[PDB]
Amino acid sequence: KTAFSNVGRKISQRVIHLFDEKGNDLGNMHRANVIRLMDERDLRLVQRNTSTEPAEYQLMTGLQILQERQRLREMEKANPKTGPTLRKELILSSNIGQHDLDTKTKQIQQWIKKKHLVQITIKKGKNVDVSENEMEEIFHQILQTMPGIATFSSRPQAVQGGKALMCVLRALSKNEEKAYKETQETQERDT
RNA sequence: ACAUUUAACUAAAACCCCUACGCAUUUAUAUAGAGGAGACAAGUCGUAACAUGGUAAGUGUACUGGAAAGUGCACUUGGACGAACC
Ligand SMILES: [K+]
Ligand SMILES: [Mg+2]
Ligand SMILES: [Mg+2]
Ligand SMILES: [Mg+2]
Ligand SMILES: [Mg+2]
To answer: Would you name any one GO CC term?
Structure first.
């Protein structure tokens, strides 16, 4: 998270690949020599590209610093590209009551609808002996509620020496969805 | 609605009416189904309250929510502010 604003008269790095206001390449110069050009022409330096290993800074007028981001306010509006996926966690118990399993199963439907990743963990119930035969039958019971909407990303594993099982769910991908749709129509309509 | 008759040298005889009660009305019971409260006391999801209970608590009202509840507006102390200046 950054902004196209002036860095000020405090430069962290001694050597900077300075750039002219008109786009001319001044070339690498000492940090002290950079401030001389900020006063000589009353201009502000903005870091154009952090990624490059050599420091890159371009000095431009205040109006030039407004027009730049004023276009970054439209590019994201016109073509927003927000793809981060939040990860959610749930820790259930083998002996979880059905009512609590229907309330937590409806919470997963809101997460899958918002394209989140649901990490589900199941633990041995309090003073209850149970294997992984019926302890792994809750995932299939939760996924069934979401037939097309959700599908496994990861699969049940013995995270902690078999006492607990962890799985990850995701929203069905567009392509996958179409495949599911296509299959559903043939079973009933063709018959 | 209904009618004064016979009799009368001692005096008597004669008499006999029609309409109500209902698909009205009152109260209670039985039954399909639905939903409270209590007792008992498991399990499950949380941790709302009691300490400034970890966002002080609560009243009224409104909206909201798996659930205790949360928020807004006004009100209360059945809260506190540490009690010379510095
Ligand atoms: K409270
Ligand atoms: Mg509490
Ligand atoms: Mg509290
Ligand atoms: Mg209140
Ligand atoms: Mg709210």
So the answer is: mitochondrion
Residues 6 or more apart whose Cβ sits within 8 Å of residue A72: A4
- Residue A91 alpha carbon to ligand 2 centre in Å: 22
C1' (B55) to CA (A107) span, angstroms: 25
| Resolution of the structure, angstroms | 3.0
Method used to determine the 3D structure: cryo-EM
Query: For residue A60, what are its two tokens?
Result: 């431009």
Residues for chain A: how many in total?
191
Instruction: Return the number of other C-beta atoms located less than 10 Å from residue A57's C-beta.
Output: 18
Q: In what order do the strands lie in the sheet with A15-19?
A: A25-30, A15-19, A56-60, A44-49
Query: Is any atom of strand B within 7 angstroms of residue A130's beta carbon?
Result: no
The amino acid occupying position A25 is D
Q: Cα–Cα distance between A123 and A52 in angstroms, integer?
A: 47
Radius of gyration of chain A (CA): 28
Say which nucleotide is closest to residue A96, CA to C1' distance. Answer: B44
